[PDB]
Amino acid sequence: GEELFTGVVPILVELDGDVNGHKFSVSGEGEGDATYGKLTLKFICTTGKLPVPXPTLVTTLVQCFSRYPDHMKQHDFFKSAMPEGYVQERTIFFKDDGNYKTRAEVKFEGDTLVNRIELKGIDFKEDGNILGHKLEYNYNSHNVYIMADKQKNGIKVNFKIRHNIEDGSVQLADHYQQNTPIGDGPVLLPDNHYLSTQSALSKDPNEKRDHMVLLEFVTAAGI
């Protein structure tokens, strides 16, 4: 998998979500650079307008592009499972509100990294920060903690996302993630470490559709 990321790799993202009955689809395109954990993506709601705070989909919308220092390469599970891919399941918990159930599939298609996602949101309040749309358009920095799951030959990742509300308060998004290999080949079970992340959200001056230009950097550390 490492030899497949020594450069820039095209990325396609397909999302299918149903939050509180509200259906929608997101399509994203971009390129990632694992040499510097750099991600360049543009997303577009193809079903029209998005029903929830578009920023609540970042974590859901390519962790194999993280940059792993030369002394930690033996803990890169995301690339160890390539090109066959790996499955990423996750439950996001929003404080005092609903949650997201996701089942995505990361893999290669010819030479394009593809992330096919399924989303399902339930129990979301009508006037809360999510369906009420009170979240500010800006992301923060968070530490992604990762630990091995030898019994499943996969990984357990758990972190917290903090969303800025426009009244100045914060919104917690507890993330519980789990990953497993899609093939039968060997993957690398890592030591406990964590990925450092920072993202920048912005808009396209010439885009009339719902969208999200995003820049992100991710580096592994903790050892």
Curated annotation (Swiss-Prot):
InterPro entries the UniProt entry points to: GFP, GFP-related, Green_fluorescent_prot
Record has Transmembrane helix as a keyword: no
This protein's name: Green fluorescent protein
Impact upon substituting residue 63 to M: In Citrinine; leads to excitation and emission peaks of 516 and 529 nm, respectively
Outcome, altering residue 142 to D: In Cerulean; leads to improved quantum yield, a higher extinction coefficient and is 2.5-fold brighter than ECFP
Organism: Aequorea victoria
TM region positions: none
Single Gene Ontology BP annotation: bioluminescence
Entries under SUPFAM superfamilies matching the protein: GFP-like (SSF54511)
Gene: GFP
Keyword field: Chromophore, Luminescence, Photoprotein
Pfam families assigned: GFP (PF01353)
